[PDB]
Amino acid sequence: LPALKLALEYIVPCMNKHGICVVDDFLGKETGQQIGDEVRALHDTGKFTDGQLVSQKSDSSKDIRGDKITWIEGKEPGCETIGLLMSSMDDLIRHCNGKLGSYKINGRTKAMVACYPGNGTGYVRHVDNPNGDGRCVTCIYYLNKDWDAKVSGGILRIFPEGKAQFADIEPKFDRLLFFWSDRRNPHEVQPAYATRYAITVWYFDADERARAKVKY
Numbered sequence: 753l754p755a756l757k758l759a760l761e762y763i764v765p766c767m768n769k770h771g772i773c774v775v776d777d778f779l780g781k782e783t784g785q786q787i788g789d790e791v792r793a794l795h796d797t798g799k800f801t802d803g804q805l806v807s808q809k810s811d812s813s814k815d816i817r818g819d820k821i822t823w824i825e826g827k828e829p830g831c832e833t834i835g836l837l838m839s840s841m842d843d844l845i846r847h848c849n850g851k852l853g854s855y856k857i858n859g860r861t862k863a864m865v866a867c868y869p870g871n872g873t874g875y876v877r878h879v880d881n882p883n884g885d886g887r888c889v890t891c892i893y894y895l896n897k898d899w900d901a902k903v904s905g906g907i908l909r910i911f912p913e914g915k916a917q918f919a920d921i922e923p924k925f926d927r928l929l930f931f932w933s934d935r936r937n938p939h940e941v942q943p944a945y946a947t948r949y950a951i952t953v954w955y956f957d958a959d960e961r962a963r964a965k966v967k968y
């Protein structure tokens with residue numbers, strides 16, 4: 753339970769060895785459900801974008817859109833538990849600093865709340881930071897209660913380094929995931945056939961971000 757124990761006994765060794773780390777039952781049912789209620793309220797009050805344009809070849813009404821997003825700072829009214837999650841992620845990273853590779857984390861992005869609408873859209877294979885923009889660690893929190901991939905799809909498939917086999921991660925309720933943001937972890941989201949929510953924050957390495965400024 754103690755953030756420092758989780759960090760030192762699991763996250764750090766797992767990340768340095770696999771570059772990926774999954775933590776289940778991170779905040780508990782109560783808090784996880786509260787975060788779910790907050791994200792759902794954001795959706796129901798129209799705070800999300802309409803979704804990534806998947807197919808344009810169509811004509812306005814025929815357009816297909818995918819993942820919808822909304823940026824959350826964490827202090828907005830109705831988003832405080834999301835803020836609590838962010839602070840909890842920050843706490844783990846703080847306890848890991850100086851131990852995640854040779855990176856020195858000194859900041860992060862706001863939270864990106866994503867919603868795959870369940871219309872069969874996913875996210876194409878990609879690398880979060882392929883050009884050295886400063887991001888070294890991707891942190892994702894999932895909040896989909898009773899998610900069954902064999903039925904609803906939406907698996908996050910990561911292809912670690914240049915190894916043959918890949919890793920499938922179900923977007924399970926109260927699951928926390930960390931992985932290196934660079935080319936070591938290309939990944940994709942398989943088609944989702946039910947509403948799928950995730951909250952992502954990216955952590956910056958001090959040196960990479962300092963020189964990224966000279967790239968604009």
Ligand SMILES: O=C(O)CNC(=O)c1ncc2c(I)cccc2c1O
Pocket residue numbers: 819821866875880892908923939940941950
């Ligand atoms: O949701 C997951 O399990 C994994 N998603 C992603 O990798 C992922 N990566 C980058 C993203 C961007 I630049 C913008 C919207 C959504 C998004 C994503 O959803």
Ligand SMILES: [Fe+2]
Pocket residue numbers: 878879880939
């Ligand atoms: Fe990604």
